[PDB]
Amino acid sequence: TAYDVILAPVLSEKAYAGFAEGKYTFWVHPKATKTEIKNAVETAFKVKVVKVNTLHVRGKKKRLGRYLGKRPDRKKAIVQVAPGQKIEALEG
Amino acid sequence: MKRTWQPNRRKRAKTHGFRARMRTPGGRKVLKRRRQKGRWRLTPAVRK
RNA sequence: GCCGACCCGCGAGGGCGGCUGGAGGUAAGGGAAGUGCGAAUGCCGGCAUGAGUAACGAUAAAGAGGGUGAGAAUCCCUCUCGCCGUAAGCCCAAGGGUUCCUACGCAAUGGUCGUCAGCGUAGGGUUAGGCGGGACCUAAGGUGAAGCCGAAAGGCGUAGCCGAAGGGCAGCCGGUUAAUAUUCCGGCCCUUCCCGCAGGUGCGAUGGGGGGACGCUCUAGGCUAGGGGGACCGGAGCCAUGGACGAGCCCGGCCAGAAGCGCAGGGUGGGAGGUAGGCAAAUCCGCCUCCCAAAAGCUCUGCGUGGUGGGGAAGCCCGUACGGGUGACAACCCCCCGAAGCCAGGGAGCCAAGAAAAGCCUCUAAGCACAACCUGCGGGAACCCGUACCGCAAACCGACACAGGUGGGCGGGUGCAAGAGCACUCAGGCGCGCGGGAGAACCCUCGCCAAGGAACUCUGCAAGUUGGCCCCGUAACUUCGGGAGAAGGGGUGCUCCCUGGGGUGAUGAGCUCCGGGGAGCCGCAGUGAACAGGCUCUGGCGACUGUUUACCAAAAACACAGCUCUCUGCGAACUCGUAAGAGGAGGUAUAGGGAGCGACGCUUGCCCGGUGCCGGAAGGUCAAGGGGAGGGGUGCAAGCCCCGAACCGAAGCCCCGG
RNA sequence: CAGUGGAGGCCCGAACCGGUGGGGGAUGCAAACCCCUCGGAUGAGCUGGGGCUAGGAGUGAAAAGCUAACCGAGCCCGGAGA
RNA sequence: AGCAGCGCCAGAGAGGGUGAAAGCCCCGUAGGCGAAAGGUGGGGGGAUAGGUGAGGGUACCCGAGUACCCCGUGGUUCGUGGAGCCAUGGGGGAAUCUGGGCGGACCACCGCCUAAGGCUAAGUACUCCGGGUGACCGAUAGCGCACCAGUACCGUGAGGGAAAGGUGAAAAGAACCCCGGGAGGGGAGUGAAAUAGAGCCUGAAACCGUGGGCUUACAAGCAGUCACGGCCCCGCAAGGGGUUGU
RNA sequence: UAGCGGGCGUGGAUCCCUGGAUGUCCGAAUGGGGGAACCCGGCCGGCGGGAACGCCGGUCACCGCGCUUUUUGCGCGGGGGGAACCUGGGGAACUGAAACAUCUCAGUACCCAGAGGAGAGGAAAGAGAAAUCGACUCCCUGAGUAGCGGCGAGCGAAAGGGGA
Ligand SMILES: [Mg+2]
Ligand SMILES: [Mg+2]
Ligand SMILES: [Mg+2]
Ligand SMILES: [Mg+2]
Ligand SMILES: [Mg+2]
Ligand SMILES: [Mg+2]
Ligand SMILES: [Mg+2]
Ligand SMILES: [Mg+2]
Ligand SMILES: [Mg+2]
Ligand SMILES: [Mg+2]
Ligand SMILES: [Mg+2]
Ligand SMILES: [Mg+2]
Ligand SMILES: [Mg+2]
Ligand SMILES: [Mg+2]
Ligand SMILES: [Mg+2]
Ligand SMILES: [Mg+2]
Ligand SMILES: [Mg+2]
Ligand SMILES: [Mg+2]
Ligand SMILES: [Mg+2]
Ligand SMILES: [Mg+2]
Ligand SMILES: [Mg+2]
Ligand SMILES: [Mg+2]
Ligand SMILES: [Mg+2]
Ligand SMILES: [Mg+2]
Ligand SMILES: [Mg+2]
Ligand SMILES: [Mg+2]
Ligand SMILES: [Mg+2]
Ligand SMILES: [Mg+2]
Ligand SMILES: [Mg+2]
Ligand SMILES: [Mg+2]
Ligand SMILES: [Mg+2]
Ligand SMILES: [Mg+2]
Ligand SMILES: [Mg+2]
Ligand SMILES: [Mg+2]
Ligand SMILES: [Mg+2]
Ligand SMILES: [Mg+2]
Ligand SMILES: [Mg+2]
Ligand SMILES: [Mg+2]
Ligand SMILES: [Mg+2]
Ligand SMILES: [Mg+2]
Ligand SMILES: [Mg+2]
Ligand SMILES: [Mg+2]
Ligand SMILES: [Mg+2]
Ligand SMILES: [Mg+2]
Ligand SMILES: [Mg+2]
Ligand SMILES: [Mg+2]
Ligand SMILES: [Mg+2]
Ligand SMILES: [Mg+2]
Ligand SMILES: [Mg+2]
Ligand SMILES: [Mg+2]
Ligand SMILES: [Mg+2]
Ligand SMILES: [Mg+2]
Ligand SMILES: [Mg+2]
Ligand SMILES: [Mg+2]
Ligand SMILES: [Mg+2]
Ligand SMILES: [Mg+2]
Ligand SMILES: [Mg+2]
Ligand SMILES: [Mg+2]
Ligand SMILES: [Mg+2]
Ligand SMILES: [Mg+2]
Ligand SMILES: [Mg+2]
Ligand SMILES: [Mg+2]
Ligand SMILES: [Mg+2]
Ligand SMILES: [Mg+2]
Ligand SMILES: [Mg+2]
Ligand SMILES: [Mg+2]
Ligand SMILES: [Mg+2]
Ligand SMILES: [Mg+2]
Ligand SMILES: [Mg+2]
Ligand SMILES: [Mg+2]
Ligand SMILES: [Mg+2]
Ligand SMILES: [Mg+2]
Ligand SMILES: [Mg+2]
Ligand SMILES: [Mg+2]
Ligand SMILES: [Mg+2]
Ligand SMILES: [Mg+2]
Ligand SMILES: [Mg+2]
Ligand SMILES: [Mg+2]
Ligand SMILES: [Mg+2]
Ligand SMILES: [Mg+2]
Ligand SMILES: [Mg+2]
Ligand SMILES: [Mg+2]
Ligand SMILES: [Mg+2]
Ligand SMILES: [Mg+2]
Ligand SMILES: [Mg+2]
Ligand SMILES: [Mg+2]
Ligand SMILES: [Mg+2]
Ligand SMILES: [Mg+2]
Ligand SMILES: [Mg+2]
Ligand SMILES: [Mg+2]
Ligand SMILES: [Mg+2]
Ligand SMILES: [Mg+2]
Ligand SMILES: [Mg+2]
Ligand SMILES: [Mg+2]
Ligand SMILES: [Mg+2]
Ligand SMILES: [Mg+2]
Ligand SMILES: [Mg+2]
Ligand SMILES: [Mg+2]
Ligand SMILES: [Mg+2]
Ligand SMILES: [Mg+2]
Ligand SMILES: [Mg+2]
Ligand SMILES: [Mg+2]
Ligand SMILES: [Mg+2]
Ligand SMILES: [Mg+2]
Ligand SMILES: [Mg+2]
Ligand SMILES: [Mg+2]
Ligand SMILES: [Mg+2]
Ligand SMILES: [Mg+2]
Ligand SMILES: [Mg+2]
Ligand SMILES: [Mg+2]
Ligand SMILES: [Mg+2]
Ligand SMILES: [Mg+2]
Ligand SMILES: [Mg+2]
Ligand SMILES: [Mg+2]
Ligand SMILES: [Mg+2]
Ligand SMILES: [Mg+2]
Ligand SMILES: [Mg+2]
Ligand SMILES: [Mg+2]
Ligand SMILES: [Mg+2]
Ligand SMILES: [Mg+2]
Ligand SMILES: [Mg+2]
Ligand SMILES: [Mg+2]
Ligand SMILES: [Mg+2]
Ligand SMILES: [Mg+2]
Ligand SMILES: [Mg+2]
Ligand SMILES: [Mg+2]
Ligand SMILES: [Mg+2]
Ligand SMILES: [Mg+2]
Ligand SMILES: [Mg+2]
Ligand SMILES: [Mg+2]
Ligand SMILES: [Mg+2]
Ligand SMILES: [Mg+2]
Ligand SMILES: [Mg+2]
Ligand SMILES: [Mg+2]
Ligand SMILES: [Mg+2]
Ligand SMILES: [Mg+2]
Ligand SMILES: [Mg+2]
Ligand SMILES: [Mg+2]
Ligand SMILES: [Mg+2]
Ligand SMILES: [Mg+2]
Ligand SMILES: [Mg+2]
Ligand SMILES: [Mg+2]
Ligand SMILES: [Mg+2]
Ligand SMILES: [Mg+2]
Ligand SMILES: [Mg+2]
Ligand SMILES: [Mg+2]
Ligand SMILES: [Mg+2]
Ligand SMILES: [Mg+2]
Ligand SMILES: [Mg+2]
Ligand SMILES: [Mg+2]
Ligand SMILES: [Mg+2]
Ligand SMILES: [Mg+2]
Ligand SMILES: [Mg+2]
Ligand SMILES: [Mg+2]
Ligand SMILES: [Mg+2]
Ligand SMILES: [Mg+2]
Ligand SMILES: [Mg+2]
Ligand SMILES: [Mg+2]
Ligand SMILES: [Mg+2]
Ligand SMILES: [Mg+2]
Ligand SMILES: [Mg+2]
Ligand SMILES: [Mg+2]
Ligand SMILES: [Mg+2]
Ligand SMILES: [Mg+2]
Ligand SMILES: [Mg+2]
Ligand SMILES: [Mg+2]
Ligand SMILES: [Mg+2]
Ligand SMILES: [Mg+2]
Ligand SMILES: [Mg+2]
């Protein structure tokens, strides 16, 4: 149970913005600590994280026909990898 | 002019809240009917 | 279902024909009922009438050129014009909940239009040890082990626990995105936790003590925010339209910052002995004794400085968008005004006498003294939730893009005596999401009016007059304060001249604050605009400030200080509760409950027959109960069973008095 | 007596609280608004936040006022097809 | 699947569907078969717990704040009544079969029953749930809800509480061209039918409209009716229909 | 539930019955709190470099009964839900009586506790008039009788008999 905190990378000009610097932001699992997003991405991309930042993404409400919706909630965490390091895995 | 509905969430929840309803035999029946009627919301909701 | 001028029937009906419809229907003869509608201000739905009518939601206001586009009064851009500017600008909190930013789009929503939008589709967007909240404290209150009470449900309640805009706690300046930023980045600066160590000390708390820890009004010293002037510093520019190349005009001359130093403040007595108190744990605190210093020292905070980091205008080219360059290598300095903020637990006066608990410090107990505390340094660790956007409103509460409502902070300049007032105006933001014409009555809001001047009218209702400041002056009456802004008057602008005082500097100049004297000028008019009392006299009621019928009454009603009566001796009376219990009150007759009157002045008469209340150990009546003569039913009886006189029996009522 | 001092349910007046008179509004901007005027404005003051008190009950500077836009007894469901 | 011709089945001619009206096409129906697993299960069987005698003597025991009595009440058909019985808040308070209770005051007789400890299946009640059936509804009915309803919306809250079903057999859901920014249409095309074209079966009424016929600007009105007349229309005429001038 | 993009099935897929597994968070909700779905812990293990931080597995509410050496312990149980039915505790008023008070409505409505596939009741200190019957419950009947009653309005049994 570890490739479970990491969900998928966030893909957005703004996400990319910080690849250049040391900053990889991705969708984590909503109940994850920063203490865990850490030991997670650490044992997952074989880097050292010096800094995790998080924020919830209250899910917007879409709709269709009369049927009135509500998209699921989320939690970007954004990791600042030890100096110099990188994650080719993401740098496409 | 000051109308009557002056929302405040602590208030809403402290007073018609679930914890609150369970607390008294009165509210317990309320939950009871609410449920036995098949209401979707058993008690007012509060976005804070 | 639609049509029929045909047929049958007294009629409700039935039949036949044509057209529509496109999958059910149900003889003769019987049976059974949710069985026939025009009305119920009936119920549901649809659709009319009024009527192309009223309205299109503040009278802050528009106009033009260009662009976009199938289509523009209505969207973008530009110029001109207008409105807000203690706001109609800006930042918090609440509520709201994606309304934020992009891209595409206009069916509906938008009171018109719409290419636009707060609308539809889609994608993005909210980053924190230090901001806020939680891994802290306690408040009313809530909950609640014990315990108490209640038919049940439940009520009360100690300890404790929960509860915050209050206590405690470590981040300031600046840059960057379309959209977040004490959150990312830059710079400077901090906090806890753990580990190792150095040094140090009897260490150690949930217990003891200190502290935190407090009202109102007025207020000093110093400083900051903030603001004004500068001939001084920097700057691209400008000479118009009669004059000016100048001490010209226009722009800008700051921000953060550890140690240290300085300025200003807060806090704090030191030493020794004795101790019976802080539920006998103490080196602490309290209290007694004497000696010293009377202030420093030590401790803390604010500001200034401070290594250095940052920022930095008008104007000009590119520009839809919105910025980026120029733009300086910018300058970054003097002087003045100055807080309600800071130093902060400052000071003085007053009576109505002004939270708690933790942090922090200190004392010790158990326990440990190879621990453990304390200080420095090094290395490590530091979670959870909020963070978009709206926020006096078109995004909150008002069914609405509603002229209503909504707590805190900032809120520039000039002028006016002052100000958060008024007029104009920066920054910033708007012209209120139907327009165009016309120039009738009538309505609304507003201006003016000959002569008169309350004749109006229920009433000077309404309007008007008056209006600020300065000086002169001011009555009855008075409770000596008042009445007073009584009344009534005069002055007020601008120019030159002489001059007094206060402030900063230094005592001086400059700046600034408040004046006094003369000479003179113009106009109808000088608080030239805006803010801005009409006055007197005399009755009634109510003393007075206050309170009230949210939405027809604001008053002479309620309240009130004050007066009298009355109850109440404390487990008080009284009130809420079935009770426990609580309030009264952690009060104690100078108190508390009830009642009436209602500042203050002078006063308050007679009538206890009735009613109430208070008193009255007599008497009279008086219930259960006690009593048991006497009578009854039944049995063969012993018995069992019932009725019942006198007589004893409270309060109440009677009676007696106040 | 003068000085100093800075009291007060003191005075004038914004914010703020309020509703005196008039006009307007009356299928309203508005189920209580607008304009002009007016009252209080250091107090028996106004106000945010957290709490407690309710139906014969609470609260009431007392109007039978208020208790979620009609209160001489709230609203809801029920007895109920009184 | 109708009509026609000739057949067959039936322990099955209940019902449903298939392009309309099917015993024989389809799913069923009659009849009959089936459980490894879970549940149920004395109905059958077995076992265990338990249980069962007669006479005599003895007078030990046989449910206590109980019986019983009185005061206050409840239950019962019983409303204080002649008021018992059962129950019990207050007071007094026994006996152990020569004991006690009852048989409607009470007493005597006769007779009944054994209080003050407890347990016991079935027959009974109901219907959230599953199924079967209807001289039950057929979308304003039937549940409030046939549909995404205890919703939307309304209320602080308890709580209130809707509307809304149907193309066609099959989507074959209308390529493509044309006008239009779109919408929407006109052709083309599909279909038996498209005024079945997509909230689309049927499609009534009010209500709005376009065309045509008769009529109306000296006329008085519950709007109609009776008469005559003119015009228009159906029929050869006799006739009728529409309109309305007086 | 079409579509885009991909797969699976006679090596019996889908699907239906049965048993098992997993089963976040809240809710009796039970480690503590709390404004339900959130927040914060103690203990024993585990994870990461892992002491600080975080996560993962387990475990910790309260009451009653039993056992245990006071106790600490250990086990068994309770708690909450359920359309209607049932039982116990409590218990109206409109209304009827053509007013109204006894009375009626009605031990109904409802509130509360409990029970359960039912619940109650149940093996005579009975019936009540026959030297008779023989637990209890249910239906028929007895009977609108007996009676009760401001003898108003109304209310209204039992024994016995036939049944389950
Ligand atoms: Mg949307
Ligand atoms: Mg027909
Ligand atoms: Mg038939
Ligand atoms: Mg028949
Ligand atoms: Mg009918
Ligand atoms: Mg009918
Ligand atoms: Mg009718
Ligand atoms: Mg009418
Ligand atoms: Mg019309
Ligand atoms: Mg008109
Ligand atoms: Mg008009
Ligand atoms: Mg307008
Ligand atoms: Mg103007
Ligand atoms: Mg224009
Ligand atoms: Mg162009
Ligand atoms: Mg174009
Ligand atoms: Mg063009
Ligand atoms: Mg103001
Ligand atoms: Mg939206
Ligand atoms: Mg923004
Ligand atoms: Mg539109
Ligand atoms: Mg429009
Ligand atoms: Mg509108
Ligand atoms: Mg456009
Ligand atoms: Mg366009
Ligand atoms: Mg455009
Ligand atoms: Mg930092
Ligand atoms: Mg934690
Ligand atoms: Mg006690
Ligand atoms: Mg606490
Ligand atoms: Mg902080
Ligand atoms: Mg922003
Ligand atoms: Mg920004
Ligand atoms: Mg060493
Ligand atoms: Mg010590
Ligand atoms: Mg020692
Ligand atoms: Mg301590
Ligand atoms: Mg201490
Ligand atoms: Mg202390
Ligand atoms: Mg203390
Ligand atoms: Mg304080
Ligand atoms: Mg300054
Ligand atoms: Mg300055
Ligand atoms: Mg220069
Ligand atoms: Mg010139
Ligand atoms: Mg200028
Ligand atoms: Mg200029
Ligand atoms: Mg000095
Ligand atoms: Mg001592
Ligand atoms: Mg000693
Ligand atoms: Mg000692
Ligand atoms: Mg010492
Ligand atoms: Mg010591
Ligand atoms: Mg200084
Ligand atoms: Mg400085
Ligand atoms: Mg400086
Ligand atoms: Mg410097
Ligand atoms: Mg320097
Ligand atoms: Mg360190
Ligand atoms: Mg933000
Ligand atoms: Mg507003
Ligand atoms: Mg609204
Ligand atoms: Mg508007
Ligand atoms: Mg306000
Ligand atoms: Mg200011
Ligand atoms: Mg407008
Ligand atoms: Mg004039
Ligand atoms: Mg005149
Ligand atoms: Mg004149
Ligand atoms: Mg005149
Ligand atoms: Mg006259
Ligand atoms: Mg008169
Ligand atoms: Mg007047
Ligand atoms: Mg004048
Ligand atoms: Mg006067
Ligand atoms: Mg002047
Ligand atoms: Mg000097
Ligand atoms: Mg004045
Ligand atoms: Mg007189
Ligand atoms: Mg007089
Ligand atoms: Mg008087
Ligand atoms: Mg007054
Ligand atoms: Mg009023
Ligand atoms: Mg007390
Ligand atoms: Mg007491
Ligand atoms: Mg007390
Ligand atoms: Mg006292
Ligand atoms: Mg006197
Ligand atoms: Mg007298
Ligand atoms: Mg005597
Ligand atoms: Mg005798
Ligand atoms: Mg005798
Ligand atoms: Mg005899
Ligand atoms: Mg005798
Ligand atoms: Mg005697
Ligand atoms: Mg007596
Ligand atoms: Mg007496
Ligand atoms: Mg004063
Ligand atoms: Mg005053
Ligand atoms: Mg005054
Ligand atoms: Mg205020
Ligand atoms: Mg008022
Ligand atoms: Mg008034
Ligand atoms: Mg009017
Ligand atoms: Mg206050
Ligand atoms: Mg009531
Ligand atoms: Mg209501
Ligand atoms: Mg009834
Ligand atoms: Mg044959
Ligand atoms: Mg058939
Ligand atoms: Mg088989
Ligand atoms: Mg079988
Ligand atoms: Mg059986
Ligand atoms: Mg045997
Ligand atoms: Mg045996
Ligand atoms: Mg014998
Ligand atoms: Mg007794
Ligand atoms: Mg007896
Ligand atoms: Mg009785
Ligand atoms: Mg009785
Ligand atoms: Mg009687
Ligand atoms: Mg007897
Ligand atoms: Mg008794
Ligand atoms: Mg007898
Ligand atoms: Mg006898
Ligand atoms: Mg069923
Ligand atoms: Mg059924
Ligand atoms: Mg329906
Ligand atoms: Mg319908
Ligand atoms: Mg249903
Ligand atoms: Mg609403
Ligand atoms: Mg298609
Ligand atoms: Mg077409
Ligand atoms: Mg073609
Ligand atoms: Mg277009
Ligand atoms: Mg279309
Ligand atoms: Mg057809
Ligand atoms: Mg048709
Ligand atoms: Mg269409
Ligand atoms: Mg349609
Ligand atoms: Mg039609
Ligand atoms: Mg014709
Ligand atoms: Mg004519
Ligand atoms: Mg014709
Ligand atoms: Mg398992
Ligand atoms: Mg759970
Ligand atoms: Mg919990
Ligand atoms: Mg922990
Ligand atoms: Mg662990
Ligand atoms: Mg290691
Ligand atoms: Mg356990
Ligand atoms: Mg033993
Ligand atoms: Mg249960
Ligand atoms: Mg029942
Ligand atoms: Mg009656
Ligand atoms: Mg009657
Ligand atoms: Mg009647
Ligand atoms: Mg009952
Ligand atoms: Mg059960
Ligand atoms: Mg059964
Ligand atoms: Mg049973
Ligand atoms: Mg039983
Ligand atoms: Mg027995
Ligand atoms: Mg019995
Ligand atoms: Mg026998
Ligand atoms: Mg009578
Ligand atoms: Mg009865
Ligand atoms: Mg049977
Ligand atoms: Mg039966």
Swiss-Prot record, chain A:
GO BP, one annotated term: translation
Q: Which UniProt keywords apply?
A: Ribonucleoprotein, Ribosomal protein, RNA-binding, rRNA-binding
Instruction: State the similarity comment.
Output: Belongs to the universal ribosomal protein uL23 family.
The annotated subunit structure for this chain is: Part of the 50S ribosomal subunit. Contacts protein L29, and trigger factor when it is bound to the ribosome.
Function summary: One of the early assembly proteins it binds 23S rRNA. One of the proteins that surrounds the polypeptide exit tunnel on the outside of the ribosome. Forms the main docking site for trigger factor binding to the ribosome.
Q: NCBIfam families under this entry? A: PRK05738.1-3, PRK05738.2-4, PRK05738.3-2
Protein name, per record: Large ribosomal subunit protein uL23
Name the species this protein comes from: Thermus thermophilus (strain ATCC BAA-163 / DSM 7039 / HB27)
Q: Which gene encodes it?
A: rplW
Curated annotation (Swiss-Prot), chain B:
Report biased composition (Basic residues) as residue ranges: 29-48
Q: Which GO terms describe its cellular component?
A: ribonucleoprotein complex; ribosome
Output the InterPro entries linked to this UniProt entry.
Ribosomal_bL34 (IPR000271), Ribosomal_bL34_CS (IPR020939)
Citing just one GO molecular function, the answer is: structural constituent of ribosome
Instruction: Cite the NCBIfam families for this sequence.
Output: rpmH_bact
Give the function comment from the record.
Found on the solvent side of the large subunit.
This protein's name:
Large ribosomal subunit protein bL34
